[PDB]
C-alpha cells in the first residue's frame, strides 16, 4: 500500500558476466547505422544462444555491451564455471563474427561471482536487471580488462574450484575502481 | 511477536539517551566511555569561555585572576590527543567556580553548548580520578555523535522490539528511508526545552520550529500515511526549570503562547507549578495541531511528557507505549 | 526493425544515488535503496500517461538513468523537440517531490539531442525495443558530460528550441570521443 510492490529480491552464490566492444567508436567509423545493428544483432543473437548452453541467463544489452548472469532463476553451485565457459565461447564467437565485419572487432569480458538484488524497477516497460556493489564491480572488471581476455576477480577463482590456469590480471593498474578497493584480479589462459 | 520501532526527531532531542534506556532496562565495557567523558568536559568549559567575547555584551570575569586559565584553556582548545593532566582539572573548576563563567553559561542559549555541561562540570572532582568509573547517570549524560544506523534489539516479557536509532541532523536525514518499509510504530523525539534556541545546522532556525516541521514532515510523509507516532516531548526537566526561573520567556520567541491557556483534559504532575502544565501542554498542542489536520484515523499520535535521561520516567512510559503497540494490533 | 529522420533522445540520470546506494544488514544489503529507486522510477513513469505527454515513448533505464524519446510516431514539425524538454522540467518536478519526502538533494541531470536514429529489437533470448545512431550515444554523451539541474543540447538542438521559445547559452566545447570537439549548450529556466 505504501510503496509501490517491489518486485525484487536477494540471490546469494551467483557470478556476474560483463562484456564489451573494443574499438566500437572507431568502427562506428567506417560501416553505416545499419551495418552495425546488422553485426550487433548477429553476435547477440549468437551470444543468446550461447547462454541456454552454458546455463546463463542474459540480464540486458546496453549498445555495444553484452551482460549475462549465472545462477538464476534457481540457484547452482556450479555457477562460476558457467561463466567462465560462457565468456570462452562468447570470445571464440567474435572471432567467427570477425568474418562478416572484415574489421578488427574484439570482445572484453569481466566477470565477478557475489550477491545481487534481481528483477525490474518502475511501471512501464519492464527489463530484466540486477543491482549490487559486487554487480558495480562486475562491470569494472569488464571496464578494467583485457582485450580477448576474460577477466576474474579473487571471489570468482574461489568458486572457479581452481579448474583452469590464471595469470595476474593487475586490474589495479588498468581501472581506478579496482585499484581503490585492492581488489587482486586474474586472467584466464 | 516482533515489532520494529524507529526513533525520529532533529539534533540532540534525546533519540540516543533512549536507546540507552533500553539497554539499562532490558538487556566490564564502561571503561571505553570514560574517555568520551572527559571530552565532553573538556569541550563544555572551553565552549562558554570561548563564547565570553564573542557576545553583546562580552561577559567579563568576576576574578581577574582566572584570565590565565581562560589563557590555558583556550591553549589547548585544538590539541588532538589530550591527556587531561591534573592541572586541566583544576584550572577546568576553578573556570566552573568563576561567576562571570556561570553567567556566561546562564546565557548558553545564544552559543550552542551540549545538555550535561552543568552536570559534568558539578563532578570534575569526581572524574578526575583515575580509580574513578562512571555511573549510570553519567552513561546517561555522556553526549556522543550519531551518524549511521543502529540496531539493537531487546526483549520484555518474551516480546520481542527491534530499535533503530539515526543520525538527526540534517545531512543525516537522507538515511532515514531506508527505515520506512515495515516500521510497526515512529518515535518521534522532541527537546521541549530547546525553545529559546537554534540549532548547530546553520545557526539560525529555531530547534523547535525545526522539529515541528519534521514532524509535520514525518507526520505527512507518503510512505507514513498508516504508521502511528509516539510522541515524546523530551527535556521536561530542562524545561520545567528554564520555564520558572523565567528568564527566557516562551512568548518571546513563539508568540502564540500570549494567547493559549491551560486544557481540561490536563493532568499534572502531583504539586507542580500551573505555568509548567502551561507550557509543556503548549508544546503538546503545538504537535497535535500539526496532527490533528490529516490523516484522518488511518495512523494516530501520541503524546508524552518524558525526561530521557530520568531512568524512572523512561521505564513508565516505555510501558505505556508496549500497551499501545499491543492494544491497536500493529 | 526501421530508422527514422528526426527522433528527440533523452538521457537523464540521477549521479548522486550512486554514493546513496549502500549495502548493509541494516538496509537489507541495499534493497531498501532500490526501494526508493523503484519509486522514483514509477514517479517518472507516471507521465508517460499524461496528455501533454502521451507522444513520448520510454525506452529504457540503465541503473538510475532514465533514457526516452520523442517523434517515434510519424510517417510545430519539430513540436516533439520541445515536449521532450518539457518532460525532462517534469521529471525534476517529481524528483523535488521525491527529495522532500525522502530527506535528499537529489539532483537529474540531461542530455538531449534529436536526428537520424534506427529503431527495432535485438536479442534472442527476450527481443526488446530500443534505438540506435549517432543521435542517441551523443544525447547520452550530453548526459556524461552534464550538469545537475540544467538541460546539455547540441547546437543543432539549440537552434530550433530558440524557434520555439527557448533561449540558451553555450558550455563550450566537449570531446566527443570518437566524433571530436563538439560545441554543446545549456536550456536557460
Ligand atoms: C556512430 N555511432 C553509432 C551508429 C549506429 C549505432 C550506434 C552507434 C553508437 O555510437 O552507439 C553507442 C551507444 O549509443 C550504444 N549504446 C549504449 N547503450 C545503449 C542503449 O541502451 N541503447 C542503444 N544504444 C546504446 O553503444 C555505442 C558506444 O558504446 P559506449 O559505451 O558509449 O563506448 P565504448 O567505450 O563502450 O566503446 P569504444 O570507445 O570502446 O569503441
Ligand atoms: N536534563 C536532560 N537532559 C536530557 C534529557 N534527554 C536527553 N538529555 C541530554 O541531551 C543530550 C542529547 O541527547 P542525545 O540522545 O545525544 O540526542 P540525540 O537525539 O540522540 O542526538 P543525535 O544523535 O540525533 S545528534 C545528552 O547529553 C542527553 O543526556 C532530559 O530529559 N533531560
Ligand atoms: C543503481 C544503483 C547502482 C549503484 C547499482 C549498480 O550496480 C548499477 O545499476 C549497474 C553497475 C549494474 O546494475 C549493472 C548494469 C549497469 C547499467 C552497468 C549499472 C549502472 O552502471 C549503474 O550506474 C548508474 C547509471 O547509476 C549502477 C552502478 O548503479
Ligand atoms: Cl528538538
Ligand atoms: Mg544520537
Ligand atoms: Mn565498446
Ligand atoms: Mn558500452
Redesign the interface.
Known amino acids: 500500500m505504501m510503496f509501490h510492490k517491489i518486485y525484487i529480491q536477494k540471490h546469494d552464490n551467483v557470478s556476474i558476466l560483463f562484456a564489451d566492444i573494443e574499438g566500437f567508436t572507431s568502427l562506428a567509423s567506417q560501416c553505416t547505422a545499419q551495418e552495425l545493428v546488422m553485426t550487433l544483432n548477429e553476435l547477440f543473437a549468437r551470444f543468446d544462444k550461447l547462454a541456454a548452453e552454458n546455463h546463463c541467463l542474459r540480464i540486458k544489452i546496453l549498445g555495444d555491451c553484452y551482460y549475462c548472469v549465472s545462477g538464476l532463476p534457481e540457484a547452482r553451485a556450479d555457477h562460476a564455471h558457467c561463466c567462465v565457459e560462457m565468456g570462452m565461447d562468447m570470445i571464440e564467437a567474435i572471432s567467427l563474427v570477425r568474418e562478416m565485419t572484415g574489421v578488427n572487432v574484439n570482445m572484453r569480458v569481466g566477470i565477478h561471482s557475489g550477491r545481487v538484488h534481481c528483477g525490474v524497477l518502475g511501471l512501464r516497460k519492464w527489463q530484466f536487471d540486477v543491482w549490487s556493489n559486487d554487480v558495480t564491480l562486475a562491470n569494472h572488471m569488464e571496464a578494467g580488462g583485457k582485450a580477448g581476455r576474460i577477466h576474474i576477480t579473487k571471489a570468482t577463482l574461489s568458486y572457479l574450484n581452481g579448474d583452469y590456469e590464471v595469470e595476474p590480471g593487475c586490474g589495479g593498474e588498468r581501472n581506478a575502481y579496482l585499484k581503490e578497493h585492492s581488489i587482486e584480479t586474474f586472467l584466464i589462459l | 511477536a516482533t515489532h520494529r520501532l524507529l526513533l525520529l526527531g532533529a539534533g540532540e532531542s534525546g533519540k540516543s539517551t533512549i536507546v540507552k534506556q533500553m539497554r539499562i532496562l532490558h538487556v566490564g565495557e564502561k571503561a571505553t566511555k570514560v574517555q568520551d567523558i572527559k571530552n565532553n568536559l573538556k569541550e563544555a568549559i572551553e565552549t562558554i569561555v570561548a563564547a565570553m567575547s564573542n557576545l553583546v555584551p562580552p561577559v567579563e570575569l568576576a576574578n581577574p585572576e582566572n584570565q590565565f586559565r581562560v589563557d590555558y584553556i583556550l591553549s589547548v582548545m585544538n590539541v588532538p590527543d589530550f591527556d587531561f593532566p591534573p592541572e586541566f582539572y583544576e584550572h577546568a573548576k576553578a573556570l566552573w567556580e568563576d561567576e562571570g563563567v556561570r553567567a556566561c553559561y546562564e546565557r548558553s542559549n545564544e552559543y550552542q553548548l551540549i545538555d550535561c555541561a552543568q552536570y559534568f562540570l558539578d563532578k570534575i572532582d569526581v572524574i578526575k580520578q583515575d580509580d574513578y568509573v562512571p555511573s549510570d547517570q553519567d552513561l546517561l549524560r555522556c553526549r556522543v555523535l550519531t551518524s549511521?544506523?543502529?540496531?539493537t534489539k531487546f526483549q520484555v516479557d518474551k516480546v520481542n522490539f527491534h530499535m533503530?536509532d539515526v543520525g538527526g541532523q540534517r545531512d543525516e536525514?537522507?538515511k532515514?528511508?531506508?527505515?520506512?518499509?515495515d516500521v510497526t510504530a515512529i518515535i518521534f523525539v522532541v527537546a521541549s526545552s530547546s525553545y529559546n534556541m537554534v540549532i548547530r545546522e546553520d545557526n539560525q532556525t529555531n530547534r523547535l520550529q525545526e522539529a515541528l516541521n519534521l514532524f509535520k514532515?514525518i507526520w505527512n510523509?507518503?510512505?507514513?500515511?498508516?504508521?502511528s507516532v509516539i510522541l515524546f516531548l523530551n527535556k521536561q526537566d530542562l524545561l520545567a526549570e528554564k520555564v520558572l526561573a523565567g528568564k527566557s520567556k516562551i512568548e518571546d520567541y513563539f508568540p502564540e503562547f500570549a494567547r493559549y491557556t491551560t486544557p481540561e483534559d490536563a493532568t499534572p504532575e502531583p504539586g507542580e507549578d500551573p505555568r509548567v502544565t502551561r507550557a509543556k501542554y503548549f508544546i503538546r498542542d503545538e504537535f497535535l495541531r500539526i496532527s490533528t489536520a490529516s490523516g484522518d484515523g488511518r495512523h494516530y499520535c501520541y503524546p508524552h511528557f518524558t525526561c530521557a535521561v530520568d531512568t524512572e520516567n523512561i521505564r513508565r512510559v516505555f510501558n505505556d507505549c508496549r500497551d499501545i503497540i499491543q492494544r491497536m494490533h500493529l | 526493425h526501421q530508422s527514422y529522420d528526426c527522433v528527440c533522445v533523452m538521457f537523464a540520470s540521477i549521479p548522486d544515488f550512486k554514493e546513496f546506494y549502500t549495502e548493509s544488514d541494516v538496509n537489507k544489503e541495499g534493497l531498501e535503496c532500490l526501494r526508493l529507486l523503484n519509486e522514483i522510477i514509477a514517479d517518472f513513469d507516471d507521465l508517460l500517461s499524461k496528455p501533454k505527454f502521451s507522444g513520448v515513448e520510454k525506452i529504457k533505464t540503465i541503473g538510475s538513468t532514465y533514457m526516452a524519446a520523442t517523434g517515434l510516431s510519424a510517417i510545430r514539425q519539430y513540436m516533439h523537440i520541445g515536449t521532450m524538454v518539457e518532460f525532462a522540467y517534469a521529471l525534476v518536478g517529481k524528483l523535488d517531490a521525491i527529495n522532500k519526502h525522502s530527506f535528499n538533494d537529489f539532483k537529474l541531470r540531461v542530455g538531449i539531442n534529436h536526428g537520424p536514429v534506427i529503431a527495432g529489437v535485438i536479442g534472442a533470448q527476450k527481443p526488446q525495443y530500443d534505438i540506435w545512431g549517432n543521435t542517441v550515444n551523443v544525447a547520452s554523451r550530453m548526459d556524461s558530460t552534464g550538469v545537475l539541474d540544467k538541460i546539455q543540447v547540441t547546437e543543432e538542438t539549440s537552434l530550433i528550441l530558440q524557434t520555439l521559445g527557448y533561449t540558451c547559452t553555450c558550455r563550450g566545447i566537449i570531446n566527443v570521443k570518437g566524433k571530436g570537439d563538439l560545441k554543446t549548450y545549456f536550456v536557460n529556466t
Do not use: P, V
Not at chain 2, 549511521?148 to 540496531?151: A, K, Q, S, T, V
Not at chain 2, 510523509?221 to 504508521?227: A, G, K, M, V, Y
Open positions: 549511521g544506523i543502529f540496531e533503530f536525514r537522507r532515514w528511508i531506508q527505515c520506512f518499509n514532515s510523509n507518503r510512505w507514513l500515511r498508516t504508521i
